[PDB]
Amino acid sequence: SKARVYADVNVLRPKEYWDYEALTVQWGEQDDYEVVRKVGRGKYSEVFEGINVNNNEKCIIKILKPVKKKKIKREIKILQNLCGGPNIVKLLDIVRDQHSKTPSLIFEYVNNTDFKVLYPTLTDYDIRYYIYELLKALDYCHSQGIMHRDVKPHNVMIDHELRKLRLIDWGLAEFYHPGKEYNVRVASRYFKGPELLVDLQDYDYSLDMWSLGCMFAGMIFRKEPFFYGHDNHDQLVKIAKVLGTDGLNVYLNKYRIELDPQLEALVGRHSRKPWLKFMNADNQHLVSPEAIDFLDKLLRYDHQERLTALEAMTHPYFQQVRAAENS
Numbered sequence: 001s002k003a004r005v006y007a008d009v010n011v012l013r014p015k016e017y018w019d020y021e022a023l024t025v026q027w028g029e030q031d032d033y034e035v036v037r038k039v040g041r042g043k044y045s046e047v048f049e050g051i052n053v054n055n056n057e058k059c060i061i062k063i064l065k066p067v068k069k070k071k072i073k074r075e076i077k078i079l080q081n082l083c084g085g086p087n088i089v090k091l092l093d094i095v096r097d098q099h100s101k102t103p104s105l106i107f108e109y110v111n112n113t114d115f116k117v118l119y120p121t122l123t124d125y126d127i128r129y130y131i132y133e134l135l136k137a138l139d140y141c142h143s144q145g146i147m148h149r150d151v152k153p154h155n156v157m158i159d160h161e162l163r164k165l166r167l168i169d170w171g172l173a174e175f176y177h178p179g180k181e182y183n184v185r186v187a188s189r190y191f192k193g194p195e196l197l198v199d200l201q202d203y204d205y206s207l208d209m210w211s212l213g214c215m216f217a218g219m220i221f222r223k224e225p226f227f228y229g230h231d232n233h234d235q236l237v238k239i240a241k242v243l244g245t246d247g248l249n250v251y252l253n254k255y256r257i258e259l260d261p262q263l264e265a266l267v268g269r270h271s272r273k274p275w276l277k278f279m280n281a282d283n284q285h286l287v288s289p290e291a292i293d294f295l296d297k298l299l300r301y302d303h304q305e306r307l308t309a310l311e312a313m314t315h316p317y318f319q320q321v322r323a324a325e326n327s
Contacts, residue, residue: 006176
């Protein structure tokens with residue numbers, strides 16, 4: 001399988017662009033940056049609000065848990081390559097504790113609002129607007145030959161006050177090379193595309209569009225998460241109970257994948273469930289025919305059939321947002 005767009009980005013660019021293993025990190029001064037308070041944490045890092053002692057400006061400090069040097073070089077190089085793109089978090093500095101040699105990445109400060117309280121208050125238009133802004137970031141990174149691979153609400157920072165959005169945590173992102181086989185143990189469970197759940201390793205930028213779709217479905221249906229699987233196998237079953245088993249089997253035979261017997265049995269047979277059946281009194285104000293049409297072009301088994309981020313931004317569902325932007 002190859003990507004339908006931006007397939008040759010890394011083929012055209014110099015090896016220095018994408019050979020992250022050969023990067024040479026110019027370490028800054030650890031003292032320039034002081035931690036003020038913890039604002040987050042995950043499996044690979046702790047995140048703090050900090051201060052730049054010289055300009056006394058706020059910043060974000062991400063202290064990395066121990067991992068192989070390669071993964072560290074990957075995140076940095078990707079951040080450096082994307083620096084300046086729309087709605088991509090900006091890496092400001094890189095520093096290491098002399099003794100421990102524990103790295104910290106320093107980023108511009110963003111005043112994020114917790115999605116668990118933000119989302120149920122967004123109005124129809126707000127959704128349109130933030131999903132458009134997230135699309136700009138995704139089209140930009142794909143255009144630069146990179147896949148994010150962990151798109152989820154937690155990785156989308158929003159400052160509802162200022163209307164500002166940033167795509168963060170590029171720790172799982174990789175460079176796309178035509179025909180390369182990637183690890184399928186990426187993304188977070190609820191946002192994993194079928195390709196990952198069926199061991200299709202030669203995936204591409206379209207993976208991020210599946211994840212974006214899941215996010216979107218979650219916001220317009222107020223059903224977070226939308227596909228609530230317990231383990232990887234159950235995740236596939238949860239998708240199949242909605243999209244239906246016929247499309248899955250068409251997909252598997254097209255890419256010549258055999259599902260493992262246990263899994264096959266878990267999946268079973270299921271008819272497709274119309275998106276309208278998830279409509280209810282709490283979400284109704286969010287669910288236009290254009291919302292459903294867009295969602296439908298995102299959540300497809302076949303990664304090759306999904307809308308690309310560029311196409312997505314021109315869908316009529318966004319036209320007011322576009323108009324607003326054109327001043």
